[PDB]
Design a protein around this ligand. Structure first.
Ligand code: CL
Length: 177
């Protein structure tokens, strides 16, 4: 069972996150982690805070801690994959993100991140496949059409690129009134 000290520290780190400042919160998340060792939740939370601070490399190594405790932690992989992609470590992000999508096969955003990771790794064809899936799962999103258009310009398929761009145009008009 969760100890009183741990409840207190959780309680405070929530005030600190919701009141803006995750540098303070981070100190209380570590206190919580100290009292409830082998609870993945405070570690997972530190990972989030570190990512928001911009300490991305440090965030990854904390998300690995939570993934050692809970190998299938679906959200820990999601966020790890997302920062790995921001750091431009594409090869490493691919297996992480591919696991996210095998757990949440209708998550358009997972597939979008996956597409960007493949594209970064110069696997254009695989990235199109993934970004296409994002577009099928959420056809009103401008961003996914936009990328899928550019991927197709590089593939020299200007017809389907133009389709996606003329769609980006359409969404922009109809998201005023
Ligand atoms: Cl792109």
């Amino acid at each position: 069972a969760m100890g009183d000290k741990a409840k207190l520290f959780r309680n405070i780190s929530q005030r600190c996150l919701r009141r803006g400042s995750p540098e303070e919160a981070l100190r209380f998340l570590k206190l919580w982690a100290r009292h409830e060792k082998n609870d993945p939740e405070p570690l997972y939370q530190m990972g989030i805070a570190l990512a928001n601070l911009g300490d991305y490399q440090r965030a990854v190594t904390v998300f690995d801690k939570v993934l050692k405790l809970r190998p299938n932690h679906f959200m820990a992989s999601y966020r790890k994959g997302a920062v790995l992609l921001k750091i431009k470590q594409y090869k490493l992000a691919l297996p992480v993100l591919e696991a996210v999508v095998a757990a949440a096969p209708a998550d358009a955003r997972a597939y979008y991140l996956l597409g960007l990771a493949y594209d970064g790794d110069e696997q254009l064809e695989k990235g199109i496949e993934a970004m296409q899936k994002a577009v099928d799962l959420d056809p009103e999103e401008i961003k996914y059409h936009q990328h899928l258009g550019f991927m197709n310009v590089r593939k020299d398929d200007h017809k389907t690129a133009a389709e996606h761009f003329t769609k980006v145009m359409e969404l922009e008009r109809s998201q005023d009134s």
